[PDB]
């Protein structure tokens, strides 16, 4: 049973920079993203709040 809703129009604008906030699950701070064995290092680029890769 499909969504049933269709698109009428697409506009390109610029994000406020204050509404990007709240469009953000967490701030990343750890440079080294690859773990010693190849898993995600917490607070790095690959994180488990930015989704399961």
């Amino acid at each position: 049973n499909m969504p049933w809703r269709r698109l009428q129009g697409i506009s390109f604008g610029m994000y406020s920079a204050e509404e990007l906030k709240k469009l953000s699950v967490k701030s990343i701070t750890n440079p080294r993203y690859l773990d010693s064995l190849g898993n995600p290092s917490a607070n790095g680029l690959y994180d488990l709040a930015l989704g399961p890769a």
Partner: protein, 57 residues
Amino acid sequence: RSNSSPLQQMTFETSFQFLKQATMLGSHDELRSPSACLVVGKVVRGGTGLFELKQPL
């Protein structure tokens, strides 16, 4: 450049200049081209898609 479709005009060439333009102008797209209709997953507005069917109740 004299084209009313930002989604077209960026599926052709210089896609980043045509995106920067469409972005600093708030340019709106009506999803009526074949390219803009295939980018957002619609049915093209020519040939077989040009009319409805309207099953009567």
